[PDB]
């Protein structure tokens, strides 16, 4: 839909909405070698 | 591990994510959508 994008906040607890994925947490940068078709990331027990 | 895996079930609901259900429907049947999740999670906790 027509919603306003917000600039990147990092290393703080924040609500986040990435393409309708609503969540709450802290953002950081990581050395995860994502393949070009790979979009999301998961681990044990299928948590984002 | 089994508790954390079981946290991501549906128990007869339309989705396994509370925020996905809450942003999808209006309250007066979102509450009966989430009541089944409540029953399943209490049963899981009592078993554990």
């Amino acid at each position: 839909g027509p919603k306003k994008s917000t600039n990147l906040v990092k290393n703080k607890c924040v609500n986040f909405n990435f393409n309708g994925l609503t969540g709450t947490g802290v953002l950081t940068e990581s050395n995860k070698k994502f393949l070009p078709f790979q979009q999301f990331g998961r681990d044990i027990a299928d948590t984002t | 591990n089994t508790l954390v895996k079981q946290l991501s079930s549906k128990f007869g609901a339309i989705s396994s994510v509370l925020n996905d259900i809450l942003s999808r429907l209006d309250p007066p049947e979102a509450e009966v959508q989430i009541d089944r999740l409540i029953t399943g999670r209490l049963q899981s906790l009592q078993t554990y």
Partner: peptide, 28 residues
């Protein structure tokens, strides 16, 4: 610790810690 206790500690092996963030805590 004695060599026996060191061997027993090394023999028993104690991402999985980050998944216990849904109200689950392990007290020391």
């Amino acid at each position: 610790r004695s060599p026996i206790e060191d061997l027993l500690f090394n023999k028993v092996t104690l991402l999985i810690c980050a998944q216990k963030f849904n109200g689950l805590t392990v007290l020391p």
